[PDB]
Design a protein around this nucleic acid. Structure first.
Ligand SMILES: Nc1ncnc2c1ncn2[C@@H]1O[C@H](CSCC[C@H](N)C(=O)O)[C@@H](O)[C@H]1O
Length: 327
DNA sequence: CCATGCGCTGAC
DNA sequence: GTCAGCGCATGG
């Protein structure tokens, strides 16, 4: 993460829904806000959250009464995506996991916070010919909010990863906010090779298979794009190998292949997948965050997560607007 | 629960 | 024709 000297959100309160590792909390806390409620149902995720922040998040949101939730200023939610991703089937609103937005809508109707900050995958902006995005937009206008949405790629904000996502921000109409804007892009000066750990700390992650079909040469100069070097098996998901001189591919939660959930990379002559700490780093987490002791569950958590740096520049821009109240 | 071979869809 | 995805399905 980045350091913030000007703390634009000092007296505001917010809630962490679909908490996961607490990516939204780290970001909003560095700007000065305070957390008064958190929710998440996975046994193991609750263990890490507690290890780092000190509290246990409430369970299943579908059976919690919206009237018991504390008063607050900003609502945060990175809702589920299996039903909208380009890698899965595409059932959408007909999916048992695709109805979560309506619970946000339900909680929003009672507490009426000032800001709503949500995140989901790129294909959500294009799913069902745009009907899904419109249902979200119109439901939001009906509740008396304005709707701003956009797709930002992480390689444009300082992190070496090709993770594309849609961020949605909405302000209550009494406020009359007319100057909100998404952060501007800038040049990348850090690459995958600058986040890696020493060779000794790994060894056990190396893979020597006899399918290595080198199909390109190692490049000699850095570049902000994924550069493919070879294939294993049939070159399907998890059997593709990349150069440590470009950027990482999107980390995932339920992925497969011999180089599962992280992909494979050519390092000092050998091919291997990434370590949980290198996963923390390509996602913007600080070395002081404690990861779960089960490596298998650690990989699933970083893959469902959110990149801190981008949430930080966006949050700062929410506060600037709330603070511009001239006579 | 953990490991790993797959096969289709979207935006060039 | 090329290439990538906060995934799905099946075995122990
Ligand atoms: N019915 C439900 N009630 C409560 N939590 C739920 C839920 N369905 C899914 N979840 C949780 O929703 C999360 C979606 S992914 C969100 C990740 C988070 N932004 C990050 O910083 O890590 C998962 O952790 C999932 O376990």
């Amino acid at each position: 993460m980045i350091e913030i000297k000007d703390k634009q959100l000092t007296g505001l309160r917010f809630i962490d829904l679909f908490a996961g590792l607490g990516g939204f909390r780290l970001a909003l806390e560095s700007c000065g806000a305070e957390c008064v409620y958190s929710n998440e149902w996975d046994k193991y995720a609750q263990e890490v959250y507690e290890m780092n922040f000190g509290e246990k998040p409430e369970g299943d949101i579908t059976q919690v009464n919206e009237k018991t939730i504390p008063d607050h200023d900003i609502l945060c939610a990175g809702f589920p995506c299996q039903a909208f991703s380009i890698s899965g089937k595409q059932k959408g609103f007909e999916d048992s996991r695709g109805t979560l937005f309506f619970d946000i809508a339900r909680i929003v109707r009672e507490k009426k916070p000032k800001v709503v900050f949500m995140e989901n995958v790129k294909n959500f902006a294009s799913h069902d010919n745009g009907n899904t995005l419109e249902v979200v937009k119109n439901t939001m206008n009906e509740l008396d909010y304005s709707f701003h949405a956009k797709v930002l790629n992480a390689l444009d904000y300082g992190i070496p990863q090709k993770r594309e996502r849609i961020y949605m921000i909405c302000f209550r109409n009494d406020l009359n906010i007319q100057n909100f804007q998404f952060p501007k892009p800038f040049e990348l000066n850090t690459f995958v090779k600058d986040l890696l750990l020493p060779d000794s700390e790994v060894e056990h992650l190396v893979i020597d298979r006899k399918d290595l079909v080198m199909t390109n040469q190692e490049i000699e100069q850095t570049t902000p794009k994924t550069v493919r070097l070879g294939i294993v098996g049939k070159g399907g998901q998890g059997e593709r190998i990349y150069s440590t001189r470009g950027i990482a591919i999107t980390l995932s939660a339920y992925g497969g292949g011999i180089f599962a959930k992280t992909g494979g990379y050519l390092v000092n002559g050998k091919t291997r997948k990434l370590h949980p700490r290198e996963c923390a780093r390509v996602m913007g987490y600080p070395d002081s965050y404690k990861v779960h002791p089960s490596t298998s569950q650690a990989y699933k958590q970083f893959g469902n997560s959110v990149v801190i740096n981008v949430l930080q520049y966006i949050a700062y821009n929410i506060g600037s607007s709330l603070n511009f109240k001239p006579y």
